Structure 1
Amino acid sequence: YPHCLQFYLQPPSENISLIEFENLAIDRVKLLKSVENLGVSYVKGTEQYQSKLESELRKLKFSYRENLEDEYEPRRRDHISHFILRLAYCQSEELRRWFIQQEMDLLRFRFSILPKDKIQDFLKDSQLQFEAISDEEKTLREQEIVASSPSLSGLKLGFESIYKIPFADALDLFRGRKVYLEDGFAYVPLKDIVAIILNEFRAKLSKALALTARSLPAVQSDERLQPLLNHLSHSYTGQDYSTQGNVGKISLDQIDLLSTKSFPPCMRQLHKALRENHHLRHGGRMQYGLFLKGIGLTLEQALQFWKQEFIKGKMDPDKFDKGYSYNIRHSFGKEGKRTDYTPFSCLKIILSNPPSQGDYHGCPFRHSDPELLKQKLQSYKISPGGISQILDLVKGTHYQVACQKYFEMIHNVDDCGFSLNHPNQFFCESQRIL
């Protein structure tokens, strides 16, 4: 929205704090993930896409007020965050492709925001030399320009600017006879112009990432930056909310209703297994116990629930006290953290602890077979068109997007108004609508 449209070169030489470093990295990761989610769920030409993208930009403080020349806060934020994430995403080729694809969507959106006035100044100032034509030359060669133009309908050479460029830089256009040439200059409208800018940006970004990947071992020795390079998408989400504590009051006899109405497919499947077989494996026990702790259950209530469910399995109550009470009290209590104290997130469920025979944990859209997935979803009273859309998104590895559509369909809303990244957050947002 400001003059933040910039080709990302000339790495910064400023110095900053650790907290600013990590906040910038997290904010840029969140913005890129939001761009991907918007591109997958929507298209690149609707008002919803632009509105949500600009709302994300405004919330993350990437386009805001000005200051005295040097310290324009959103410009500094954008520059430093981009060059920080280059290090994190330069390692692997797949990560490089992801980073390049997501970074160009933001550039395209920023270019679309600008009015037809500032883009000329941006082009002239950007690299070294770029120029357009005035009204006299535009009208003098109008017929030739429209004749040489692509299948663009009509003779309406409207108010859209037409730019003259060296023919070589327009190679991808003039090799197929789609532009007008005169004295080695090609006349090109805005669409092909932005295509050219995207192509050059992709080339430069790929080259810069490839060069950066070489000098990566010189920085792997820093212990402060270890959670940056390797652990930006490992098990901890971009920005998670549901932790221990909070406020909540949920009865014990109401769990059955919430299993059908509120619980996500994975948690409801675990609940069905627990209520049917009266026993769960270690992964299922840990996952469901952490989930139940997250929703607001207390130590006494959880102990009573697990004991009552396990006694129905014909075991000794003293055996439960000596075998399973310790684990629950340790989960609800003090240190021994980071694996027994925070409820599992969507990324941890998907990318860690794959299930096997006898294990019912994991994400149904990720681990369960597609045929079993359809068989499951048919039991939830899901419309066949929604089933087809969910299966289509599952193919493109958009499991969380499929769950977003699941929530929107089951709770009868057009848009959930958020991006889900945690089953406990799914439950909380289902309770909010009620």
Structure 2
Amino acid sequence: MFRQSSEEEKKLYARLYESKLSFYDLPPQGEITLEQFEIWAIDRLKILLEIESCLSRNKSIKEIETIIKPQFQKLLPFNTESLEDRKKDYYSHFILRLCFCRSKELREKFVRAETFLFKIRFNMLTSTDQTKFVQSLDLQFISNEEKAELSHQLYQTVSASLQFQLNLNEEHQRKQYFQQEKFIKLPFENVIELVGNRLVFLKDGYAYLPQFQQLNLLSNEFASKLNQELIKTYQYLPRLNEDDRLLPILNHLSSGYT
């Protein structure tokens, strides 16, 4: 049969937003303006302020998504090929690190709001994008034999969840889905919020988690790594103090949370 046969910064941000979301993993390079610094930080700050306001009003995920999604096209676009939007998103996150690393209360508020925004944007993805994003983060499934041995317990655990979360009211549909579903085994301490609600099966100190759940692990890893990075950011704030032109902006940004 027949057969034939700075740019680096732009490539970096194309790579960082191929997954459409990022853990915000890497040091930015090159330059932007100081006006851009202020405006981009304020835009992300407005979205996070509304997220915290809605959470203080005890609104649900669906309501917050209805409130916040129209704001992306104006303040902080998502699911976009534009280099400007990608740089705006990335840089605004990094700026608010330096604003909100300053104290435990600021770190907690910023981690909460940013993790909830992460959850919102992850919900906006297609399942293929979610899979690719999770795989890009280098993030144990059980064997078919172990699934067969624990099938009664796992099905008893997830059958209600399949009906209420995936709308599978028919038991036949639940059985077919369960036959196609994969399960993850990890220590129970890693998914303790699901343990307290008895949403996972426990055996010998390990929790058995279906593949259609477990986004709380992803968002908790995002929150934990962001908290550690903020702690690091706090430790080298004395180097930020070398440019005076940034400190009034950061003081202004933090004043809306104090």
Report the TM-score when normalising by structure 1: 0.45
Counterpart AA for 1:205: L
d(CA) in 2 for partners of 1:49, 1:199 = 19
How far is 1:204 from its partner? 1.1
For the Cα contact (< 8 Å) 1:27–1:60, is it kept in 2?
yes
d(CA) in 2 for partners of 1:169, 1:77 = 39
d(CA) in 2 for partners of 1:175, 1:34 = 30
For the Cα contact (< 8 Å) 1:104–1:202, is it kept in 2?
yes
**In 2 relative to 1, CA 31–218 (structure 1 residues): closer, same or farther, beyond 3 Å?**
same
Q: Which has more radius of gyration?
A: 1
How far is 1:215 from its partner? 0.6
Aligned to 1:315: none
Which of 209, 212, 227 aligns to 1:206? It is 227
Which of 92, 114, 134 aligns to 2:125? It is 114
Aligned to 1:125: 136
Counterpart AA for 2:59: V
For the Cα contact (< 8 Å) 2:140–2:185, is it kept in 1?
no
Counterpart AA for 2:186: F
Which of 68, 88, 107 aligns to 1:77? It is 88
Pairwise CA RMSD: 3.8
**In 2 relative to 1, CA 26–175 (structure 1 residues): closer, same or farther, beyond 3 Å?**
closer
Which of 53, 73, 81 aligns to 2:68? It is 53
For the Cα contact (< 8 Å) 1:144–1:180, is it kept in 2?
no
Which of 20, 30, 34 aligns to 2:50? It is 34
**In 2 relative to 1, CA 20–165 (structure 1 residues): closer, same or farther, beyond 3 Å?**
same
Unaligned runs of at least 5 residues, structure 2: 1-16, 164-170
Is 2:54 the counterpart of 1:43? no
Is 2:110 the counterpart of 1:99? yes
C-alpha deviations, 1:43-80, integer Å up to 9, x for none?
2243x43222110111114226425xxxx332221111
**In 2 relative to 1, CA 145–233 (structure 1 residues): closer, same or farther, beyond 3 Å?**
same
C-alpha deviations, 1:71-129, integer Å up to 9, x for none?
x3322211111011100111111111111111111011112222333222221122x2x
d(CA) in 2 for partners of 1:146, 1:226 = 56
**In 2 relative to 1, CA 115–211 (structure 1 residues): closer, same or farther, beyond 3 Å?**
same
Report how many residues are paired.
227
Unaligned runs of at least 5 residues, structure 1: 238-346, 352-434
Report the TM-score when normalising by structure 2: 0.71
d(CA) in 1 for partners of 2:126, 2:188 = 24
Is 2:156 the counterpart of 1:147? yes
Map 1:258-297 to 2 at 5 A.
none
Q: Which has the higher helix share?
A: 2
How far is 1:225 from its partner? 0.6
Which of 6, 24, 31 aligns to 1:8? It is 24
Q: Secondary structure at the match of 2:32?
A: strand
For the Cα contact (< 8 Å) 1:149–1:180, is it kept in 2?
no
**In 2 relative to 1, CA 222–114 (structure 1 residues): closer, same or farther, beyond 3 Å?**
same
